[PDB]
Structure 1
Amino acid sequence: PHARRALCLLLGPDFFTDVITIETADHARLQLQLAYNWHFELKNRNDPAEA
């Protein structure tokens, strides 16, 4: 919930080495490591509201 804390909001492309605990229709409980290839998007990188 709250582990890391930094002064900067990383906008560059990155990933999250997250693992989920999902269950399929056959009830098969399996955990699975995810990446979430993400990146922040700003069309106008000067507007105070959007920024």
Structure 2
Amino acid sequence: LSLSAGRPKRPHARRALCLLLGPDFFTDVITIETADHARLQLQLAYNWH
């Protein structure tokens, strides 16, 4: 599984045979723009299982 890893979530890193199904979390920085044209980068924990 050519997964994604790192902070800015590069699309091809962490290649790996396994696939965890447990309640983990990946932190990704996303740079989004508000309605007042003030762009801001923010992080989500993304609790997944």
TM-score by length of 1: 0.71
Give runs of aligned pairs for residues 15-26 of structure 1, distance below 5 A.
15-26=25-36
1:1-51 equivalences under 5 Å are 1-39=11-49
Larger Rg: 1
Extract unaligned runs of 5+ from structure 1. 40-51
> What is the percentage of aligned positions where both structures have the same residue?
100
RMSD: 0.7
- TM-score in terms of structure 2 length: 0.73
Aligned length, in residue pairs: 39
| Separation in 2, partners of 1:15, 1:29 | 25
Provide runs of 4+ in structure 1 moved above 6 Å. none
Letter aligned with residue 21 of structure 1: T
Displacement, 1:37?
A: 0.6
Give the distance between the partners of 1:14 and 1:27, measured in 2 at CA: 34
